[PDB]
Amino acid sequence: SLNSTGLAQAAINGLNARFYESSNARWSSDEPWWISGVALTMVIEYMRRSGSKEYLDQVEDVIEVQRQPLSWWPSGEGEFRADATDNTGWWALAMVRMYDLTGNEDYLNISIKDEAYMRQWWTDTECGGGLYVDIQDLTYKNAIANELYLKLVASLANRAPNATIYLDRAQQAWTWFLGSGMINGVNLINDGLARDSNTGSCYNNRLPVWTYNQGVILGALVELYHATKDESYLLSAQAIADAVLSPSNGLTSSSGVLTETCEGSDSCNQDQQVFKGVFALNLAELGDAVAGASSDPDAGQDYREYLDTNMQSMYANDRSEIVPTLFDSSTGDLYDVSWSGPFRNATMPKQASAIGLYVANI
Ligand SMILES: OC[C@H]1O[C@H](OC[C@H]2O[C@H](O)[C@@H](O)[C@@H](O)[C@@H]2O)[C@@H](O)[C@@H](O)[C@@H]1O
Ligand SMILES: OC[C@H]1O[C@H](O)[C@@H](O)[C@@H](O)[C@@H]1O
Ligand SMILES: OC[C@H]1O[C@H](O)[C@@H](O)[C@@H](O)[C@@H]1O
């Protein structure tokens, strides 16, 4: 059959052999720094779900160096506090997984510092809530930043000492998100909000439906369920997932393969190349929570069936292997952006998204 653990490791090896920079303790300095954080999450999640620890030394090197005050944002004072709330949020969630893997209070403390940094740009005076993404400009409360923050406070509500204040913040944050309008008529999440020129009220800006904006919210609702034992959160998550799996909504191909909207025009940029893996890994948390929340053995079978279907398509259609040489004995797998289309080339955001799908099936 298909050993997702073996292919995850081969993909991580391929990510490392092509894109990891030993001298910089980071993958691909020419790609968005926040995608290095996503990559770290995938490697941590692989280790956490497979029981292996083969990349734990490497992960710890990356943390120690990216922990330092950023050259492009020294006012953050390190600990991943960067020039945007979504930048910070990706690394914050990686530290939560780091904590889950190791149990070291140190990583949890980074997440606590990051929550407090992000909340600095939560304002109740515009849109009745939510935080801005552009720390320097304060012109956009989008979906990804508030989804990341929501999943952070919901995670802290399950792990941090003053867990109650985080439960209050997460419940208050989910209420704002739900009533914000970003969840549209088919239970998908548009990119962000826009503000009325004359009235100051906000509305769904009808910008694209990105796959990672339907994933991160699922993890937040799963964490909100673990902290409250309220299945209504799982039900809300399940509706967002169900809309994604529905081919009528354009996210799922006629072959049952997840497809970013830019894949058609072949115009997926550095950011959008990683979106799919973020959704898959989050849907795996939904499927796991759903299967355990009920005695039914078929609970979440469709989410697992979906991830499996997508894995075999990416394995057969999107895969390419590195050429070993007399000097470089490094082996592994490389992956392009389309989980059904051909393999043209591999980039770090595409590779990280491939790892996410394999880890989602581990
Ligand atoms: O490509 C769709 C997104 O494009 C814009 O943001 C790009 C990325 O910039 C940030 O630094 C990262 O943290 C990412 O989270 C973010 O996607 C925004 O318009 C965003 O809302 C779009 O979804
Ligand atoms: O993501 C890469 C990261 O490093 C660059 O040097 C800066 O311009 C940042 O604004 C950017 O976010
Ligand atoms: O339209 C919503 C939003 O779209 C853009 O991506 C942002 O740069 C903002 O200027 C604007 O408010």
Author numbering: 78 to 439
Q: Can you quote the paper on this entry?
A:
To exclude the residual α1,6-mannasidase activity of CtGH76 under crystal soaking conditions, we generated single-site mutants for its catalytic DD motif. For the active-site mutants D164N and D163N, soaking with α1,6-mannotriose resulted in α1,6-mannobiose binding to subsites −1/−2, alongside with single mannose residues at subsites +3 and −4. However, occupancy of subsite −1 is observed only in the active-site mutants, with slight variations in orientation. For the α1,6-mannobiose complex, the subsite −2 displays a highly conserved binding mode for the mannose moiety, with interactions mediated by a conserved aspartate residue (CtGH76: D268; CtDfg5: D250) that engages the 3- and 4-hydroxyls of mannose. Similarly, subsite −1 features stacking interactions between the mannose pyranose ring and a conserved aromatic residue (CtGH76: W111; CtDfg5: W83). Interestingly, the mannose conformations at subsite −1 differ distinctly between CtGH76 and CtDfg5 complexes. Firstly, CtGH76 favors the β-anomer of the mannose 1-hydroxyl, whereas CtDfg5 prefers the α-anomer. This difference may result from the mutation of D164 in the DD motif to asparagine, causing its sidechain to swivel outward. Secondly, the mannosyl moiety in CtDfg5 adopts a regular 4C1 boat conformation, while in CtGH76, the pyranose ring is distorted into an OS2-like conformation. The α1,6-mannobiose at subsite −1 adopts an OS2 conformation in CtGH76, resembling a strained substrate, with a subtle shift likely caused by the active site mutation D164N.
We characterized CtGH76 from the sordariomycete Chaetomium thermophilum, a member of the Fungi/Bacteria-mixed GH76 subfamily, revealing conserved structural features and functional divergence within the GH76 family. Notably, our structural characterization by X-ray crystallography combined with glycan fragment screening indicated that CtGH76 can recognize GPI-anchors like members of the Dfg5 subfamily but shows a broader promiscuity toward other glycans with central α1,6-mannobiose motifs due to the presence of an elongated glycan-binding canyon. Here, we present the crystal structure of a novel fungal GH76 member from the F/B-mixed subfamily, in complexes with different glycans and glycan fragments. Together with structural bioinformatics, we found that members of the F/B-mixed subfamily act as secreted GHs in glycan degradation, which includes not only α1,6-mannans but also GPI-core glycans. Compared to other GH76 orthologs, our findings demonstrate that CtGH76 features an elongated glycan-binding canyon, adept at accommodating a wider range of complex glycans.
